[PDB]
Amino acid sequence: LHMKTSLPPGLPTQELLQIQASQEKQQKENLGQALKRLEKLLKQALERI
Amino acid sequence: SELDRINAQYLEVKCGAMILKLRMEELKILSDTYTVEKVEVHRLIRDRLEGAI
Amino acid sequence: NKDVDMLCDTLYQGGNQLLLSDQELTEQFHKVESQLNKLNHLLTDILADV
């Protein structure tokens, strides 16, 4: 019953897999395209040098 | 995730600063290149080249 | 045991050192910083010449 009641806090590991997949994919999607746009502007500045 | 978000927001804020600094240097060199006299002189050059050609 | 195993595999992602940050995003930050440093060096050279 301890093994049925002493579960660690938060949603379990098999659910934590898609939890971390969703969180890391939204973290990447919010930032990587912004980095690409920044690099495009920066290389525009490089060719304007 | 918040750490990377603040990092990328800092990069987004900072890149525009040097982009606008590049713009300031270009615009200020353009301003100092042609004074009040030089603009009218170059307009007279346009007129003279047109009249010759 | 399986839960512990793929939790460790997901957090390590093949590196002995822990990878809290997204690794390809981290090297994207590094190359953005390096190219920004190169652009800043060119800009400061132009500022010195001006």
Q: Which resolution, in Å, applies to this structure?
A: 8.0
Q: Which residue has the tokens 């400061």?
A: C44
- With residues binned 3-state (H G I as helix, E B as strand, rest as coil), the percentages for chain C, rounded to 5, are 75, 0, 25
Q: What are phi and psi of A6, to 5 degrees?
A: -95, 35
The answer to whether residues A45 and C41 touch, using CB atoms and an 8 Å cutoff, is no
Contact (CB, 8 A) for B4 and C22: yes
Interface test with C, best of B1, B7, B28, B31 (most C CBs within 10 A): B7
Q: How many CA atoms lie within 13 A of B46 on its CB side?
A: 6
Beta carbons of B18 and C39 less than 8 angstroms apart: yes
Distance of alpha carbon C33 from alpha carbon C39, whole angstroms: 10
Neighbours of C21 (CB within 10 A): 15
Asked if the Cβ–Cβ distance from C36 to B4 is below 8 Å, we say: no
In this complex, how many residue pairs, one in chain A and one in chain C, have their CB atoms less than 8 Å apart?
40
Contact (Cβ atoms closer than 8 angstroms) between residue B19 and residue A46: no
